[PDB]
Automatic annotation (TrEMBL):
Organism: Bacteroides thetaiotaomicron (strain ATCC 29148 / DSM 2079 / JCM 5827 / CCUG 10774 / NCTC 10582 / VPI-5482 / E50)
UniProt lineage: Bacteria, Pseudomonadati, Bacteroidota, Bacteroidia, Bacteroidales
Keywords noted in UniProt: Calcium, Metal-binding, Signal
Positions contributing to Ca(2+) binding: 353
Short name of one Pfam family: DUF4374
Protein name: DUF4374 domain-containing protein
């Protein structure tokens, strides 16, 4: 029995009720899809009492390229001859970086949070189903309210250097009917409807409506120009899909960024809009039925990084995470407000100072979890709630967690994941 370093998939659970952190045994990532490559999970989607994730191919590890004298190497000219690269895309000699099979998408369906015996299904109609920004892999699989799972691809691989690693498929969407175990016949080419544009990430709003953060020009590694929103009605136009750019937002050349995860309530989506350069961020309400946006709460801070609701007994409030960035520091404030649609909030008092967070997740209206990314080192997390006096309070337990590149919720577990180096037997 021979042990060696191989690629695995790490899973971290934050149980919200028991307030306990667990690591799963690392899942073997090598040859996850049957072609030798290893994978990164993108998204943890709860629907139909199951977990859906997109196993995003990463190419071949050093172990994978060497395995049985290059068995898995389709394009040997791409195997790296020396260490190189930058940031989370640094590579080592012997790697084959990024997938050799860009013209397909996989989805893994798991019966529960123990992540055993996945149903793995493939489509050749779209490229892999994630968005990309730096190290992070953005969820682009989402469930309509009836349980149908829509699988979106922005065709990020079209920007790969080598022809054989670029996808030739336009950004598009496919479907897994609720309770089905394979894709059905649905397909929507989004570039045909969008004016040739793809997207950075997307989310579910309500019903069969989804929100897409659209590019003004070509998709790119830095996310430049991801400054418009569109509403996608999946079953629109006789089950062919319909895409409408959102009206009422600032001009794209006036938007610096959007806040990251929308807050959905009563059939609409609230999103923070951070303008370039006196102009303060504000929360806009996006009505998917009319694809219209209206300006609401103003946030007197640098940016907005989370929007949600917290409650305890008879108390409840909206909560807006606001960043305050100075020349020498970056601070974060949780701000309580009774409305997202008028007025303003300012740190300096109902605010509560926290560390900054790479990702913020509301668990229902009960808890707010902060997840911090730390490059190659370990991530960090803390959690917040409303006390019995309706004030914002920090939860007792904090955690050091494995490096993560995606996250989601299933049941009472917040789940985070990444592709790791790990020892495996054989
Ligand atoms: O605040 C943050 N970073 C901070 C701190 O980081 C830094 O000072 C530097 N970084 C790292 O050293 C780094 C190191 C690792 C790991 O290091 C280990 C040692 O322990 C090695 O042994 C391992 O092998 C592993 O590699 C992973 C990372 O992620 C890293 O960043 C320099 O970076 C920058 O100056 C900017 N960064 C960027 O421009 C940037 C750009 C990309 C690009 O993405 C494109 C698609 O979008 C294309 O695909 C390109 O191919 C790819 O290059 C990817 C990134 O990861 C980026 O950071 C701004 O960032 C920051 O200054 C932060 C926030 C959110 C998410 C993140 O990932 C962050 O880093
Ligand atoms: Ca749902
Ligand atoms: Ca401070
Ligand atoms: Cl629906
Ligand atoms: Cl409101
Ligand atoms: Fe990085």
């Amino acid at each position: 029995e021979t042990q060696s370093v191989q690629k695995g998939i790490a899973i971290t659970y934050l149980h919200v009720t028991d307030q306990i952190m667990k690591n799963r045994d690392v899942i073997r990532g090598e040859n996850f899809l049957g072609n030798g490559e290893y994978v990164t999970f993108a998204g943890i989607l709860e629907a139909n009492n199951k977990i859906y994730t997109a196993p995003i191919p990463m190419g071949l590890s050093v172990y994978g390229s060497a395995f049985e004298d290059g068995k898995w190497v389709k394009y040997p000219e791409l195997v790296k001859t020396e260490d190189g690269g930058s940031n989370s895309s640094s590579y080592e000699k012997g790697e084959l970086q990024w997938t050799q099979y860009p013209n397909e998408a996989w989805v893994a369906i798991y019966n529960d949070e123990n992540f055993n015996n996945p149903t793995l299904i493939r489509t050749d109609k779209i490229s892999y189903a994630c968005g990309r920004m730096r190290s992070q892999y953005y969820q682009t699989i989402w469930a309509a309210d009836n349980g149908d799972v829509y699988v979106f691809s922005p065709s990020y691989a079209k920007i790969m250097d080598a022809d054989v690693q670029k996808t030739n498929l336009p950004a598009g969407v496919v479907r897994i009917k609720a309770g089905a175990t394979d894709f059905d016949s649905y397909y929507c080419n989004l570039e045909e409807l969008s004016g040739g544009k793809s997207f950075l990430r997307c989310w579910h709003i309500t019903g069969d409506y989804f929100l897409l953060q659209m590019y003004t020009g070509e998709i790119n590694s830095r996310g430049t120009g991801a400054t418009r929103m569109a509403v996608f009605k999946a079953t629109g136009n006789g089950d062919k899909g319909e895409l409408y750019y959102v009206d009422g937002l600032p001009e794209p050349d006036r938007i610096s960024s959007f806040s990251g995860t929308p807050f959905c309530e009563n059939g609409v989506a609230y999103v923070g809009v951070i303008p370039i350069t006196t102009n303060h961020p504000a929360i806009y309400k996006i009505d998917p039925v009319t694809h219209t946006a209206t300006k609401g709460l103003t946030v007197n801070a640098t940016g907005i990084t989370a929007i949600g609701r917290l409650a305890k007994d008879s108390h409840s409030t909206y909560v807006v995470s606001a960043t305050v960035t100075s020349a020498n520091s970056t601070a974060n404030y949780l701000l309580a407000t009774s409305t997202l649609e008028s007025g303003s909030v300012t740190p300096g008092n109902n605010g509560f100072e926290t560390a900054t967070g790479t990702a913020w997740i509301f668990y229902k209206d009960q808890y707010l979890y902060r997840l911090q990314y730390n490059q190659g080192n370990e991530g960090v997390t803390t959690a917040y709630e409303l006390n019995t006096n309706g004030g914002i309070a920090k939860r007792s337990n904090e955690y050091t967690i494995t490096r993560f590149t995606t996250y989601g919720i299933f049941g009472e577990n917040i789940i985070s994941s990444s592709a790791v180096d790990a020892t495996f037997t054989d």
